[PDB]
């Protein structure tokens with residue numbers, strides 16, 4: 001497939017519950033959920049190599065990886081982790097994360113290109129899954 005594009009969020013579910021599992025207190029949880037309303041994802045994909053830029057109104061960060069090659073990024077609540085992406089199917093990838101320091105919930109994410117031109121991203125902490133849906137700008 002080709003994940004490349006400028007993606008704008010249209011739907012986000014269970015994000016507060018994910019942040020709660022991660023220990024974020026309620027006021028900052030509500031503020032974070034609001035910020036996810038302007039969540040934008042820019043993807044450049046060349047074969048198995050991905051460049052991903054995640055941005056909100058006031059913050060931007062870049063994730064760079066090749067499928068099957070360990071890299072370092074951060075968890076959803078900002079702790080540094082070692083990550084490894086693999087394909088699950090033609091159009092879906094899954095990333096497993098390992099904390100560099102300390103303990104914490106088991107975290108992962110996925111990206112999927114649907115047949116209807118949507119990008120579905122999920123973020124997981126233990127039993128709670130946040131699902132977010134994007135369309136091309």
Ligand SMILES: *C/C=C(C)/C=C/C=C(C)/C=C/C1=C(C)CCCC1(C)C
Pocket residue numbers: 032033035036039052054055056063075076077109111121
């Ligand atoms: C492939 C896509 C990835 C790894 C995206 C990761 C996105 C995040 C860790 C987003 C985090 C956010 C917050 C911590 C609060 C504000 C809203 C978000 C969703 C941008």
